[PDB]
Amino acid sequence: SERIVPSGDVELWSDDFGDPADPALLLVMGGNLSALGWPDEFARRLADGGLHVIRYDHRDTGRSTTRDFAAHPYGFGELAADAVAVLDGWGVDRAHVVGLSMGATITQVIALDHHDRLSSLTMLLGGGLDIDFDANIERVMRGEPTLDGLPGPQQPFLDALALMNQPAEGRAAEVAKRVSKWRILSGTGVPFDDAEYARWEERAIDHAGGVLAEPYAHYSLTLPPPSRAAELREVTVPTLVIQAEHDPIAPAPHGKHLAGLIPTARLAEIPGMGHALPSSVHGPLAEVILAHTRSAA
Numbered sequence: 284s285e286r287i288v289p290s291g292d293v294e295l296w297s298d299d300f301g302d303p304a305d306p307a308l309l310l311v312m313g314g315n316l317s318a319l320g321w322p323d324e325f326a327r328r329l330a331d332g333g334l335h336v337i338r339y340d341h342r343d344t345g346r347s348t349t350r351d352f353a354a355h356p357y358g359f360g361e362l363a364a365d366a367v368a369v370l371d372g373w374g375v376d377r378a379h380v381v382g383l384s385m386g387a388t389i390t391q392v393i394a395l396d397h398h399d400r401l402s403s404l405t406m407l408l409g410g411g412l413d414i415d416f417d418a419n420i421e422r423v424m425r426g427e428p429t430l431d432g433l434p435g436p437q438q439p440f441l442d443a444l445a446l447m448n449q450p451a452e453g454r455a456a457e458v459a460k461r462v463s464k465w466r467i468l469s470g471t472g473v474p475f476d477d478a479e480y481a482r483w484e485e486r487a488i489d490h491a492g493g494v495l496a497e498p499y500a501h502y503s504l505t506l507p508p509p510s511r512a513a514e515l516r517e518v519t520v521p522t523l524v525i526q527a528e529h530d531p532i533a534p535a536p537h538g539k540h541l542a543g544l545i546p547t548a549r550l551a552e553i554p555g556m557g558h559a560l561p562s563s564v565h566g567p568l569a570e571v572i573l574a575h576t577r578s579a580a
């Protein structure tokens with residue numbers, strides 16, 4: 284089913300998978316990505332393990348309130364509170380939360396400021412609050428080292444940004460362009476199927492009322508200050524950090540480092556995986572998440 288839930292001065296679209304009586308699992312997408320950034324088939328695979336999977340559209344994506352950012356600025360505090368508002372909107376007291384990419388940053392803020400709403404935490408394709416990510420993009424382009432000493436974003440990330448700059452006229456061209464971006468980010472370490480990713484983007488575009496432009500508000504966000512990383516030492520819910528082996532945006536050992544910030548964190552690695560969700564990794568991802576959520580209950 285689907286519902287629109289209130290969150291302060293925005294309204295958030297959300298839908299679910301699985302039995303409403305199973306333990307809640309909240310999926311938190313990356314930046315500029317709507318609910319449909321989580322493929323339906325992945326959400327189903329997770330739910331069919333015994334979870335009530337809920338996903339939603341961040342503000343400024345999908346069918347959620349979309350606004351001129353300059354006139355109404357917000358940050359990760361709002362993005363985290365919105366995630367909790369989705370739990371409120373489904374009557375969920377505590378949820379297994381899964382944060383992906385920029386969503387892992389959102390979920391670290393949930394862990395700090397809404398810890399009471401967590402059954403467990405899972406983060407993948409991201410890194411710690413002490414990683415000055417936007418500054419690191421600038422540094423890698425100039426050939427300067429990151430100040431954290433961990434690897435910055437790699438060439439496939441830069442390539443994906445370059446493709447995102449190229450024009451696409453019409454729906455077919457937009458879908459092909461988006462698929463080409465995911466193919467670059469996924470890499471070749473696991474099987475990538477263009478047809479399945481095309482269908483997933485067709486659904487994402489349909490979900491956005493057929494509009495072809497990607498969301499862009501989240502490019503205006505400012506990250507939490509690195510001081511907040513130290514606060515993660517107080518987190519006590521079971522935490523799983525998943526490293527995609529060949530992640531071009533947050534390469535190893537980002538994962539390990541993020542896990543090292545949280546006393547209850549355990550690290551897993553998906554062999555061959557890049558910064559994308561081809562169906563080739565749905566089984567492995569669902570397996571490790573389900574084992575984790577089971578141990579937290």
Ligand SMILES: CC[C@]1(O)Cc2cc3c(c(O)c2[C@@H](O[C@H]2C[C@H](N(C)C)[C@H](O)[C@H](C)O2)C1)C(=O)c1c(O)cccc1C3=O
Pocket residue numbers: 313314384385388408409410411412414415416417420501502503504505506532533
């Ligand atoms: C383009 C793919 C992308 O980089 C995927 C991604 C990956 C990561 C992050 C992102 O914000 C994002 C998103 O970043 C967005 C927003 C980001 N801001 C404002 C933080 C910046 O504008 C970037 C170019 O696009 C998009 C992070 O913020 C991040 C972090 O803060 C710490 C460790 C890892 C990451 C990411 O892997």
